Amino acid sequence: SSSGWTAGAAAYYVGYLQPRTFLLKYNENGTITDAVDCALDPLS
Amino acid sequence: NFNGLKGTGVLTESNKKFLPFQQFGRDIADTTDAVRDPQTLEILDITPC
Ligand SMILES: *[C@@H]1O[C@H](CO)[C@@H](O)[C@H](O)[C@H]1NC(C)=O
Ligand SMILES: *[C@@H]1O[C@H](CO)[C@@H](O)[C@H](O)[C@H]1NC(C)=O
């Protein structure tokens, strides 16, 4: 009933966004193949 | 004048792929290089004269 219930496994993740600048690489088909950050690391 | 786009050029058949949400096609200089005809779905390649 409302008191007493068994549930199965479940996992989820919640994350927060922020204004960033990214570099995106397209392919011949037109699908995004890779993306790289611009404000994370000196190499980035 | 495809869907309100006053331009002059040559229209030919194009084999390029379109994502379902994608409609237009663009190049490095922000020049429209592909359109989808509103009445009938098709791939057209705009090439200047
Ligand atoms: C489950 O069934 C019983 C049978 O009478 C009922 O009393 C109970 O309200 C039911 N569970 C819920 C959550 O309503
Ligand atoms: C408009 O054109 C499309 C494409 O041929 C057709 O499927 C549709 O029935 C037409 N509708 C009207 C109201 O003419």
Coordinates of N, CA and C in Angstrom, one line a residue, chain A residues 26 29-31, chain B residues 17-19 22:
Chain A
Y26 N 32.5 19.7 -36.9 CA 31.6 19.0 -37.7 C 32.3 18.0 -38.6
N29 N 29.1 14.4 -42.9 CA 27.7 14.1 -42.8 C 27.0 15.3 -42.2
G30 N 27.5 16.0 -41.2 CA 26.9 17.1 -40.6 C 26.5 16.9 -39.1
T31 N 27.2 15.9 -38.5 CA 27.0 15.6 -37.1 C 28.2 16.0 -36.3
Chain B
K17 N 23.4 15.7 -47.1 CA 22.4 15.3 -46.1 C 22.0 16.4 -45.2
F18 N 20.7 16.3 -44.8 CA 20.1 17.3 -43.9 C 19.7 16.6 -42.6
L19 N 20.0 17.2 -41.5 CA 19.4 16.7 -40.2 C 17.9 17.1 -40.2
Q22 N 17.3 20.6 -39.3 CA 18.1 21.5 -40.2 C 17.3 21.8 -41.5

